[PDB]
Structures are given as structure tokens and as C-alpha cells.
Symmetry: D2
Subunit: 494 residues, 4 copies
């Protein structure tokens, strides 16, 4: 069930969050935050720079020192505290979802029923792992007792984008904290507000001071002070591919801090003639147009077998005409705006290029209205491999539909790309499903569904979509460091 | 490729194997061993009894004492000794496959190409696991360091049937020895011979005395001495269901020793209309007619969907006439005899119930030849759930073809049984393949194949087909005993 | 930390709990429940026999049918419900502790601070495993995709004693529910009351009907009907070795249900001369005398090195003199009664046997008061291996103190026993700690502490103290059944 | 007993190995290779540059294509190929040890008894892991079947140093090959000859062509072509810290390939007052002076407690005089040369900074012999924290003995460094052993031993000693990439 959004929500939390207290920027500067549906200023937030980052890192190092309350408390206690944070986010679910909507342009129902729900579930999952992270006893050669410890890494920097502020934040801090690390959080400059509200709940939940620090700010300033800091042990980064290159570089030229990258995507989704046609049209559609295309996991190219091609295209055009734009808080609106003017412009350039290079425009292709950064649902057929809308990430409401003839061809083309985050496959045949999913070079493959991400399963990129995994067993374990202890004993019995 | 079999084998090993030496029996009694194809006595073997088992248990307890060679040896050295046993069985492959054919009635091609091949790779799978058995370090509540050790259990008794002497022996002593246990092997009275040759290979490979002891003999004497012994820690039994119930009670009345059981089977096999019919007919045919039906994993209930049913019965009867009985060492022969008269009588008494209860005989139904215990490849149509031939394990070359009309009803009918060792499912629909194999109450389900076991997978019964698993990670780890050590420490840090 | 007990608690729940409803017994019979400190009847409780168990089993079997809410529910959702049960138990903590005190004779501050706390922590641990139980994908030989599933077993009978009612209950239903089983709970006839109150919280928590059924009653009636039932898939039993023999047998002669056993104990405790003496005396004291010795993990035999023997004994006797017996709800009382006349007399026969066989009585050795089943804390010195107090489990406030001289001797002596549940070792030396703890034949070994069980550590017996483990990763996985699925594929790539 | 070295070995293999064929360099240039004990030339070796790397990468890619022999062979068969390579190195043990001594200046007894033994065991361990690398089946939210695959990554560049050619080669090709990757091997320019002989044995074992390619050459040319290649999926580097940063950077600006890093070291070793002093001097001496200081795992800083300091010093000086320098091949020699002139220079630079900074020269401190790159075993006492000899890696026969008094101060001091590969602790106390080893920030901690590396445990850096681990379960799994496959099903039951 879905409540009504808050009518007169007020912004309360705008300061930096360091050592469980609220700080002004060292410089005294603030930066503005805009509603993308109206273009108007919501508020100004304290702007973090290198000198604020230094303060956050000192506090996180102190919280991590041997004998501190966060290091000596039972693993199960780390767990209870993460589970309590989940309880408070659930209690404030209406507030947090109204605020996601205002700041990031998300359809309200989507933000309440999906984003907030996934964020609460990710934290609860992670909470359960805290006392079940285990090492090994090893029957090594020789007269030794040998074992391993999965220890916390230390101080972790968490840097991420604007498209899903609550989910992104949950899936970085959840794994980090349940392994016992302390953290420095740098949310995207476009959408800092829900991150700062979660900070007020971290103090309420009873986290020790310095365990979680949240410093809103820009990229070359705050983001780059974290990646090159000499006393940060790890940075987990989600964002664009070009910036991930700068992060790896920064890490190398400073202290060789561990790096995790989750970067750009152009995700293929393949529909064979033997697929359930209706279900695939619907899933592939939601694949591309969810959050107005503003999603790393969206279906960006649609390979559709020749016999069902014309009929797939026709049904996708019809499905795309069922949208109403406006303020995402208004009931009856299911198409929000793009995040800002820069993004809007990148999307329109690519749309325009598709017309230029001779893809066929089926519907949309233009901006929507006069105010707010709205773009029409846009579908393109007769798309060929070497067009720009086929290669470049659009991050907008733009579907590409292409023809394919045989199986071995469509695998070749779906893999002919420097990206590899996610891929779809639709077929009701057992052997086809298994062998094609194995053959696709992507870290997640969805069979007969799309957007089916869960907390229990690891997700991440092949190739230039990044390295490392988030969530599941495997992803949680990436916030640990392994130590082997090997002790001499006087006699050894098996 | 297939060599020719040995034409005149010297039987060298007929004595009990205890502490790496050969012993006559305490009583002096021997028992005869017969070739099922010719009825001729191959040799007499030394008959072990309670007092011989008593000797064997003392040798295995001595070999398991702390400070002994077998306990102080590096785990990777144990694995190396098991790899060496496999190399020695491989050098003697031709000899062992001939001997298995002569004693067990196994068609030479199956025994050389499948049984010896599987037995070799099984010991090699287990060899690798030895230095990879690992416990845990655990972040327990309180100021403690806690870990587990997966120790060896102790002295293990291993009792098995006659249907596949080399495979059964490998999958029991492989796992048991890789975890560091000592063992008392009790092969079937019908087929003790190959196991005695393996004894001579264990010796030359260099296993410490008393680690492996073999004592051939009868069940109510030597077997019962093992299950009832106050100093045997675990018994692993493969055999009939009624005998498994005796094992369990004797364990309880003596020393509550650990029990693993692998019992009777009546395995269903379900073929839907959208299956590859050529492939499915052939696989179901292999599954029932492999080893003259003398296999626990044999298909015996063929549920076939009504629209392909008549065709499947016609094609199955045609495949069934491509056979040639005779001495299983003869080139060309692909149908052997059954193990002895008591079993030949039991199969004929079930076959006649088939005629009498209304099933229609499509082919066979009678005895073959003059000498030896041969039975004709028999097929029955129109079989229903109430008939004895659909309820009782036949252990013979007798196919039952049953009809089904719906998915829900046939799952129901395959599950309505106290058996559950194995099952098979033939369909090319992804959804049917996954949902039906999840719904079947059996330890192994094979999809679009049959008789497709591997060393790397675990195997065993649901319900009254047994409890416990053999092979794979999980099955290997069932020959360990878990010990927690928890030590006070002065400070704890994550 | 600790409130005042409820002064006049009123018994609310006394009926059988089946299908989320309160049922009268079929026969009409009800059985009495007594307060062990006054010998007065508290109330009568409904008495289940065979026919009531039969209703419990059909309800558990229906809740476990495919398609049912309990089966189709997500695993994270099972977890949620169990964590909610832990919250309601936390909410009713004072109520359940008063009632535990009254029924079982536990000192109230122990019941509140230790038993209720451990009960809440165990459920929360298990809740966390619900969506982290995982099978494997296995690279088998051949063109196959092969995987395992850790399925729930089915209907589980859960039968336990009277010494820690709330801990026993958590540690059975927690692991079983988190795996997705349904259950029949047969609490001890001495102490059915807190179990029945928990049953009231199962409904409030929102478990589907039939997932948890509670049937109070006696052993040979309610218990034997469960263990011998044809539609119960597993029985987990805790209790006397003699009854454990009967359960194992009943399982054999009914349906070979899986059995797990956690039986009698006589736990050795070794104190070397190079230990923290002060702390060893106090730990060993709490080990013996906590819950008036009515605990399977209690220190019975106390081996103490010759050089420090006389001093250890002086300190132990002095430490045993500081007790005030009386009503377990009364402030300043730290010694409750034994549970009933049958146990009081068992313990008095064994105390008298110590006097007769020549051990030196240091303190106590008789009853306290003339109403209630109180026994003076009792200490024997000069105890030898042949005396009955050194061999038999007493389950009462009686400490045995024995001399030893050499390390190799004391190890033999502590391992010379059919029991093997727990052991203790006290030394400051790394090498002694590790080698002696490896050498002791017990399921748990505590080094420089005692009573240090946690929810994340497995626990269970060697030899005739049982088989199977409870809690930790390993114990939780004993409530699953393993299925291998192997599918034929047209091509395989690594 | 130990055999004598081969008397007049002839170098057989000097060319690049690509596609199981021997190639001349594309330019036709070769580079010289020197015996460090005589200064004399051994042979010239083809010098790979960028154009040669491009050929090897091309062959690896071709050998990794889906459908190829190395992709479609069973995992168990990759294991048998790796095990055959090890049997063959065992057979060529005498030849390979001798050649390792000649090229790497390693004492012969060492090269034969330790290095060759370790390299055979490491390969046999990884062989065991091939068909035991196992993904997961996952109970995710929703109506889905979800599982993971641990696939091979693809083309892996392997770059390493000259201090233990066979060990480093085995510890990288073993984990890489056993997960099913193909590889480009880049041996150090100073010690390529053993790599090349191993390339001949790879061919003989029957590996598919292209699976292992070996391109000897210089670092700025062949090494940097590997790390900058657009078609190389992963680079595992072992070497100096300085060069490790360039690899990380070159990977960023090319294709964001996966990077593993094992770098410089300055390993602490703390010896407490209550330690077995005799054992501790021995292990500590061996720790430093093995390989004449040329091991990254060598002890470099010895912290010795005040009560035993002077005795530790004078005992270490006596131990340092048991050395006879010369050609490692002449009987009696147990002290070999450093590798070349530039290393011989760095070491003496630092030894002379020892004299000038304050430290007391107890023995050695200058060069040895007329010819060769020998240095006297050198011990320093009274060493302080700010000295260059206590901060920078010496990689030579130089022991630093420093004094401490407090457990808390020595831990801070041991951890106050940007390095973190290995550490040592010597004590008889249980509590100090566990707590100090838990507090040290290093990847391996050895307690009451040193140089106790084993194949079954993981090893690698904390901080700027690198990231990633090698060997053991966790190390083997670093040469995989996780793919999640989530399929829609029509019904889900637990
Ligand atoms: N579950 C499985 O993996 C599996 C595998 C192969 C065979 N089987 C079963 O084995 C049966 C055929 O073999 P079988 O007839 O030799 O079985 P069986 O019960 O007649 O004898 C099996 C073994 O137990 C011994 N034995 C007999 N009585 C005993 C007693 N009282 N105490 C101790 N040991 C005793 C026998 O001497 C023999 O070694 C079939 O029912 C088949 O399903 C099961």
C-alpha cells in the first residue's frame, strides 16, 4: 500500500556529518541543490573540500583504533546496530521517499515501494552477515597449527553517483560496516539530501562517533581528496568510466589503497523467436525506461530475432505512449525529469545523432514542455552496430531496437563492446538459456526477466564496467583483508 | 579403446587382510565363490567371523592412536598415498576389469570402460580433498578466540553389496581415508575377490599397517560383528533396506556409533511430450538395462506422457531386441547373467506377478540358456501404481512403462513412495526442467540424461532410500567429526 | 540490567498448540506441574498422547506442502518472522524469566540474565542464516551443468529435557525454522510452561498455521509416538543416553527418519600447575554448581596437578560455603532446589556411594530443609577413577577433585569414558593449550574458561554423548537435505 | 641423502615460447645472462619487445576462445595436466636445481631441497583445486532460480622477479592454469633460464598450444607492453614498490584490467623474554640470511626484549660465523653471491649508512672474495627507528637487532611503516601469542617459527606491500571472475 507524499516537508540536515556532530565547511562555502522537475533551488548544503576530508579521516581512524568500542564490540553487536538503522529508515520511510523524489526526480510510488524497500532489505541482509564472516583452519604441511582471519580493512572511502541515492548508500555502507570498517561517505553533488537524513539516524541508532562520516561536495574537490588520501585504506567507487581511471591512478600515486570500481554500461538484452513475447516486451520496456533511463542496469540495446522483429517494434511503440509527465510527487505522474541540464543535453545530442545517422524514429525524439528537464519516451528501430546510439551510454528514456538473424551472430555482437555489467536473455528453451547466459561476458545475466536484482546475489562488471562485486556473500567479503597466522606446535595429529 | 580381456587369470589373493599381512581365518572355515555365467567354483575364500573382526578392529585402533604414522603424516601425504593407489589400480586395469566380470557377471566393456574408469577418477578426486579439509575461525560473543577442527572420526566399518564391487569400494575408502580415518572393509559374500586384490595394492603403495583391513565373510556373522562392536566409531552401510534397519538397531544397542545408510531404490523417470524422444528412449533404456538391471540407480518406473506414449513403447521394444547373451568375457556379448539363483528366483517371481496382475508383456518374460542365471530383456506396457512390479525393487532387466496425463498428478505419483535414491526428467522447456526437478523427492535428479554420476557430486537417499551422502565436497566431509575450541583472551579486536 | 521478579504471576496458557489454535487433549486427561521449591502443584496442563501427536503431524505436513505460504515465502521473510519472535520474547522477558524460575527452580537472576538472553541471541543468529543457506554449482566431468540445493527436510520432531527449557527450545526451533522445516515440539513433562507461552507469541508473530505445534506430555506416550511416526522426517533428541538408544531404534523400525542425539555427559576439567589458579577455581566452581549442577555441560571430574592440588582443594571448599538456599524468587537467594524427588534421590544415592567408597567429604553431603528438593553443595577430594562418583553423571551440586601427576596420564584418564560432550583445560602455555585440546575426545573444549558457549559455535557429543551438532553454521545445516541436479547441455565451456 | 649437482650442464632453451613453438625475437636482438659467482656469460636469450608480446597475447586469446580444447576439457583434466607438469619437474629435479643455482646464485642444497620441493608441491596443490572450484545456488527474493559461476578471467599477464624463479613461476601459473585462464609469463631479465626449461616440460605434458607463453625480456619494454595491452584481462605483478605503481597506472590508462600486487617489504620480528631463546636465534638467523638476504619474506627488523637482548646479540654473532662462501656448486659452500653489480652496490651503500648513522657493527660490513658478488654476513646492534637500515629494504645479508621494553610500544613500532608482508613473534605464553599476532598489520604472522610458508595457506601484503593473496583456497580463487545468473520460474518452494 502507498501513502500520500508529505505536503510541507522541510529540509533540516545540511551540515557535514563528522564524529557524530554537525559541522560547517572549513571554508564556510555552501553549494546549491535543485529540484530537476521545477529548476528551482531547494536549499544550500555545506561544501566539503580537502580540509574537511582530513577531518573525516582522522575521526574514522580514531574510531578504528585497537581497543575502541567499534573494534571490541561483538560482531553480533555490529549486526544489531545495522539492523536498528534499518528499523529507523523504515520508520521514516515516508519522509525519505518524499525527499528522494524532490531531489532526484523519481516517481514517488517508485521511490517508496522500490528504492526505500530495497535499501531497508539490503541493510538487514548485511546485518545478518556480521557474526557469520568466518576464516579457516588449514591442515598445512609440517608441525604447525595454521589459520586465517578475515579482518576489517580499515578506513574506507565510499564515492557514488546520483541516480539512486538510498540504494547506492545502503549497498556501500551495509557491507562496509558489517565487516567492521569505518567509513567516509561522499554522495553525489546532485543529490546529497537523503544521505544527510540517514546521518541523523546513525547517531540515533547508537553507532560510536567516527564510524560513519558523510561529507557532501564536488568531485575534483572532495572526491579527489579521498582517492589520494594517504590514510584511507580503501575506496569503493561507482560512477563514470573516465573517473574510475582517475581513481585507480590516484590510488597508485598515493598509498596503493584497495580499489573497487563499478563503472559505465551498455547492456544488451536478447529476444529469440521462441520467447514468451508479451512478457519480454514488458520486461525489456521497463528495462530501458525505469527511472527515466537513469540506471546503470538498464536495457540499452535490444537484439530481436527477425521473425518477431516487426511485431516486437510495433508493441514497444504502443507501450511507450502510456506516460504522463509532471511533478513526481503528483498522483498520476509516472515520468519524471532527467537530473539536470547537462544530462538533458547529452541525451538530446545522442537522440539527434540517431536521426542524423539514419536510425528510424518511431516515437518521441524531443523535449517535453518548457520547465524542468523532461524528455519524451523515444524509440529507435533499424539501429545498426556502428551508430552512436548503439555504442555510447545515453542514460535516458531512449530504446534501441536492432535486428538479428542467427544465434552465433547475436552473441558475437552482444559481446563486441568494452562494457559488461548486465545482460538479458529471453527464450523458453532450457539449453538455449543455459548456454547463452554462460557465453555472455557480463557480471549479471537475467533469463526471462529484467531488473531482478536482489540483496542475496553479487553484482558487478566484466571488462571496463569495473571490477569487484557488491552484495551477496562474495561482495560482503570484499570489505575484509586476510591474515594467515601459522604457529609452531610440538606434535601434530590429524 | 577396448583391449581384449584376460583369458586365464591366476587368482592369487584369497585370505583376510589385517595389519598389512595375510591371515587364515581363526576357525579354519572357508566359503566358496562362484562365477555367475558358468556356475563353477572360482576358488574358496577365508571365512571371517566375530573373532577375525575383533583382530581387525584392534589393528585399526592401533593405527589411529595419536603419534602413529597415519595420524602424524601431513594431510597432503595422505592425499599422495591415495593418488598412488589410483595409479596402481590404473596399471592393473585390465586385470581388475576381467576379475570383476568373472565374479560379478559384468559385461567386460562396461567393466573396463566405465567401472574401472569411474573408480580411478573417484580416488583421484578424494586425493585432492585431503589437504583441503578446513575448519573455521568464528567471531563468537565475548572475549574469546574460537575455532573448529574437522577431525577424523576413528575406526570406520564399511559394508557393501555385490552389484559394483570396485565403484562401491572406491567411493567408501576414498572419502574415509582422505579425512584420516582407519577402516574395516566387509565386501559382499558374493564378490570378495577384487577387493582382496585392491588390498595387495594398498600394501605396495605404502599405506601404514592397519589403516585398511579387509575381511570377507557373511553378513549375520562378520557384518553384525562390525555393527555391534564397542570399539567401532562409525558404520557406513550400502545394501538392502531390511538389513539397514538391523545395522541401525545394533549400533544403538552397542555404542551409539555414527551411521550412514544407502538403501533400496525404485527410481522414477518422467518423459514429457516436448522431449527429444530419440535421446530419451535411449537413456531410459540404458538406465534400466545397465548391468542386467543390477544397479541401485537403475530406472524402473518410466512415467511417459500420453501423446508420445504409444511411439515410446514401440521404440523401446525395438531397442530391447539389440542384445546377445553369453559369457561376459566373450567379444560381442552385451548381456550378462544375474548374480545367483536366489536373485534369479526373485526376479522371475516378480515377472510372473506382472503377467498375473494385468500388465501386458511386450517382450521377454522368461529365462535364457542352459547354464548360468540369465533372464531376457523384459518390457511391460500398461503398468499401474497398484501392481507389485511398480512398487517393489526388482534388481533385474525389467522395464515398466506407465502412463501419465498431467504435470501435477505425475509429480504426485512419483513422490508417493518410501523410496527416493534417484530420479530423471526429460523435457526441453526451461521452466518444466527447473520446477519439476525441485519438486521430486530424490537425492539426485538427472535432466535430459541418465546414469550421469560424477565424483564431484554428492549422492544418497531421501526417506527410506537411506540417509547421508557420498562423494562431492559434502559427502567427503561426512567422514569427519567437528570439534570447537574456545580460548579466553585478554582483549578482542575485530 | 535486572528488574524485580513478578510477585504473583498467573498461569495463562495450558492447552496443546496445534495449527495456531489451543486444543484440549483427545482423552480429556491433564497432568500436574509442580514448584520444586515448595512441592506444591502450580497447575494442570493438557496431556498429549498418540492421537494428539497425530493431529500435530498432519498440521505440520499440510503447512509443508508445496504451494503453501511457508514454502513460497522468501527466505529473508522466514528470517524476518523468527527475528520478530525474538523481539516478542525480549518484550516478555520478565514474564518468561519469573515463570522459568518457578517451574524449573532456577535462581531468578540466572534465568533473566543468562537463560533469556541466550534464548534471544540464538533466535537472532539463526534468523540471519535464513537467506544465506546456499548450495553449489559444480564443474562435473561431461557436458553437464550440475548444482546442489539445500532443501528443508520436512516435519521435524523436537524432544528435550527440563534443565534449561527456554534455551533448549530456541536451539531446536531456531535452526529448524530458519531452514524452512515445520515442527512438533515435545517439551519435558517437568517443565512445559514457558514453551506454551512461547506458543502464544508464535501466533502473534505471524507464522502460518501448522509451522510450529507444541504438544506437552510424557515420554512413553507423547515422545514415543513422535519417534515412531511414519510421517515425521527427523527427530532431534536431547536427554538421557538410555532414551536416546530407544529413539534410534524406534526410527529404524518405523521409517528411518533422520536422527540427531545429544545425550549424557561426564565432563573432565584439567588444571595444570602453570595456570591462573584464582581464575581456574572460580570457573571450575561455576562449572559444577551453576543451575545446582543440573546441566549437561557442567564440570564433574576435576583433574588437578599434584603440586597445586592441596591449595586448589582449600580454595574450592572455602568457595562452596557461600550459598543461601531458599525460594528462587526471593532476593539474596543463590541456590535453588533440584527438580523433583526422583532426581534428589538419584543424587543422594551417588553422594552416599562416595562416602562408602572412601572419598573424603570436605563439605556438605546431606539435604537442606524439610520442604523442597534442596541439597547442600558438596565437595569430594581424594577421588579415584574406579569410584561411582568419577564414572556416573550426578546432575547435582557435587564436585569431584582428583590428583594427577603426568600430562600423558591425565589425557588417557579423561578420554577413558564412553561420554564426550565437553572438556576444560587451564594452562598459560601456548603449546599445552593447543596439543591437549586437540587430544581431548570431546565436542567442545574450553581453554582458560568454562560455560563459554555462544550462538555462533557448534556444540555436540563425541562417542556416546550423541552425534550431530547444534548452532553455528554447521549445526544449522543439519536441518537441510541435499539434492544434486545434473542437466545435459549441448556445449560446455569453463 | 643429498645428490651432488650436475657437473657440466649445457643450456638448451634460449628462445621465446609462443603457441608451443620456439621463436626468434622480431627484431632479432638477444640479451646476455650472467652467472653471479663468476661474472662470466652463460648464454644470450632472445629479447622480447612490444611486437613479441602482441604475438603471445594473440595466441593466449585464441587458446581462450569458447569451443577450444582448453575451454571444453573437463576441469578434472586441467588438474591432470598440472599434475603431469609437476611429475616432470620432479623427474628433472636435479637439472632444474643445478640451473637455478647457476643463474640465481642460490646455494645448491637449498635449490634442490627447499625450492624445487616447494614448486612441485605448489603445482600438485593447485591441481587438486581445479574440479573443486564451486559457485553457489542462492535463495534470492522473488520467483527466481539464482546461481553463480566462478569462471576464468581470460588472458593473464604474469610478471615477477629473480629471487626464486621456480617458486614464483609455480605460485602464479598454478593458480592461473587451475582456474582455466591462459597466460603470458614475463620472467625477470636476470633469471629466465629455468622458466624456459619449464616451457619445454609444459609442451611435453600436453597442454594445448597458446595456453602458456613465455617471453623473456626487459621491464620497460616487454613488461610494460603486457600491462598496457588492450587485450590482456589481468596482470599479476611481483616486484618492487616503485614499479608496482607504474603497473597500476598503465592498467588504468589502457583497459582497466584486473591487477594483483605483491611488493616491497621490511618484515618485523618480535622476540619476548619468555621465548625459547635457542630456537628463536636459529629461526631469526635463517629468516634473514637464507638466500643471502634475497627474499621478500626475510626478517629485517628484530625487536628483542631487554632481559634477553645482550644474550641474543652475542648468540647471533656466533651463529653468523658458520659460513663458507664461493661457487654454490662446490661442496662445502653454504654462502652464495648476490645477483649482479647494481644490487651489490645498493646493499653496501646501506651497510655504510649503518656505520655512519650510529649502529654498532658486530660482524662483517664489507665485500668478500676477489671475484663474484659476495658479501660478508653482517649483524648490527643498537639499531634505532630513524636509521635508514631500519626503514628501507636491504635485500642482502644484513641483520638489524633493536631493543624494546613494553608490549604496547613494540606493537606500535612494528606497525609504524608503509610495508606489511610478513611478521614474527616468539613467546611461550598463550595470551601474548594470539593477541600480538592479531594486532600485527601484516598478511602472514609466524609464531615461534620463520620461513614456514606452505601451499595450503594464502600469503600477500597489507598496505604498500601490495594487495591480493596468492596460494591456499583464497589465492586460487583470485584468478576467477564471478557471474550471477538469475532465471524466472513459475513457482518457487524452499
Ligand atoms: N543406495 C545405494 O547407493 C545402493 C547402491 C547399491 C546397492 N544398493 C542396494 O543393495 C541391495 C542389493 O544388495 P545386497 O542384496 O547385497 O544387500 P544385502 O542387504 O543382502 O547385503 C549387503 C551387505 O550387508 C551384509 N549383511 C547381510 N546381513 C547383515 C547383517 N545382519 N548385519 C550386518 N551386515 C549384513 C552382506 O553380507 C553384504 O555385505 C539392493 O536393494 C540395492 O538397492 C543400494
Amino acid at each position: 500500500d502507498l501513502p500520500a507524499p508529505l505536503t510541507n516537508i522541510k529540509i533540516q540536515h545540511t551540515k557535514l556529518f563528522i564524529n557524530n556532530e554537525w559541522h560547517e565547511s572549513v571554508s564556510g562555502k555552501t553549494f546549491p541543490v535543485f529540484n530537476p522537475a521545477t529548476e528551482e533551488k531547494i536549499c544550500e548544503v555545506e561544501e566539503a573540500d580537502k580540509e574537511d576530508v582530513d577531518k573525516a579521516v582522522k575521526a574514522a581512524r580514531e574510531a578504528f583504533q585497537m581497543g575502541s568500542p567499534w573494534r571490541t564490540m561483538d560482531a553480533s553487536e555490529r549486526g544489531q546496530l545495522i539492523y536498528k538503522l534499518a528499523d529507523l529508515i523504515e520508520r521514516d520511510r515516508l519522509l525519505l521517499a518524499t525527499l528522494e523524489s524532490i531531489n532526484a526526480g523519481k516517481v514517488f510510488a517508485s521511490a517508496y515501494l522500490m528504492d526505500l524497500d530495497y535499501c531497508i532489505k539490503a541493510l538487514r541482509y548485511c546485518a545478518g552477515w556480521a557474526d557469520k564472516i568466518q576464516g579457516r583452519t588449514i591442515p598445512v604441511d609440517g608441525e604447525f597449527f595454521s589459520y586465517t582471519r578475515h579482518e576489517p580493512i580499515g578506513v574506507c572511502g565510499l564515492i557514488f553517483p546520483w541516480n539512486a541515492p538510498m540504494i547506492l548508500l545502503a549497498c556501500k555502507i551495509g557491507p562496509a560496516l558489517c565487516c567492521g570498517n569505518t567509513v567516509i561517505v561522499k554522495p553525489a553533488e546532485q543529490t546529497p539530501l537523503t544521505a544527510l537524513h540517514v546521518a541523523s539516524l546513525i547517531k540515533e541508532a547508537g553507532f560510536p562517533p567516527g564510524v560513519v562520516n558523510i561529507v557532501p561536495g564536488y568531485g575534483p574537490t572532495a572526491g579527489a581528496a579521498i582517492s589520494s588520501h594517504m590514510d584511507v585504506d580503501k575506496v569503493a567507487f561507482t560512477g563514470s568510466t573516465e573517473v574510475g581511471k582517475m581513481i585507480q591512478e590516484a590510488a597508485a600515486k598515493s598509498n596503493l589503497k584497495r580499489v573497487t570500481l563499478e563503472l559505465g554500461a551498455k547492456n544488451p538484452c536478447i529476444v529469440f523467436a521462441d520467447a514468451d513475447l508479451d512478457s519480454a516486451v514488458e520486461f525489456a520496456h521497463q528495462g530501458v525506461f525505469t527511472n527515466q533511463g537513469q540506471s546503470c542496469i538498464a536495457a540499452s540495446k535490444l537484439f530481436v530475432e527477425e521473425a518477431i522483429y516487426d511485431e516486437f517494434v510495433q508493441r514497444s511503440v504502443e507501450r511507450a505512449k502510456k506516460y504522463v509527465f509532471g511533478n513526481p510527487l503528483t498522483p498520476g505522474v509516472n515520468h519524471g525529469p532527467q537530473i539536470n541540464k547537462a544530462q538533458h543535453n547529452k541525451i538530446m545530442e545522442l537522440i539527434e545523432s540517431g536521426k542524423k545517422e539514419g536510425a528510424k524514429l518511431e516515437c518521441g525524439g524531443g523535449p517535453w514542455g518548457n520547465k524542468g528537464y523532461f524528455i519524451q519516451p523515444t524509440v529507435f528501430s533499424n539501429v545498426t552496430d556502428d551508430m552512436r546510439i548503439a555504442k555510447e551510454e545515453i542514460f535516458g528514456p531512449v530504446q534501441q531496437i536492432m535486428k538479428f538473424k542467427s544465434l552465433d551472430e547475436v552473441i558475437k555482437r552482444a559481446n563486441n563492446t568494452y562494457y559488461g555489467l548486465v545482460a538479458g536473455v529471453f527464450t523458453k528453451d532450457l539449453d538455449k538459456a543455459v548456454t547463452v547466459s554462460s557465453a555472455l561476458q557480463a557480471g549479471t545475466v537475467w533469463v526471462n526477466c529484467y531488473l531482478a536484482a536482489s540483496a542475496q546475489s553479487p553484482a558487478g562488471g566484466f571488462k571496463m564496467s569495473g571490477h569487484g562485486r557488491e552484495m551477496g556473500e562474495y561482495g560482503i567479503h570484499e570489505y575484509t583483508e586476510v591474515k594467515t597466522v601459522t604457529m609452531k606446535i610440538s606434535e601434530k595429529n590429524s
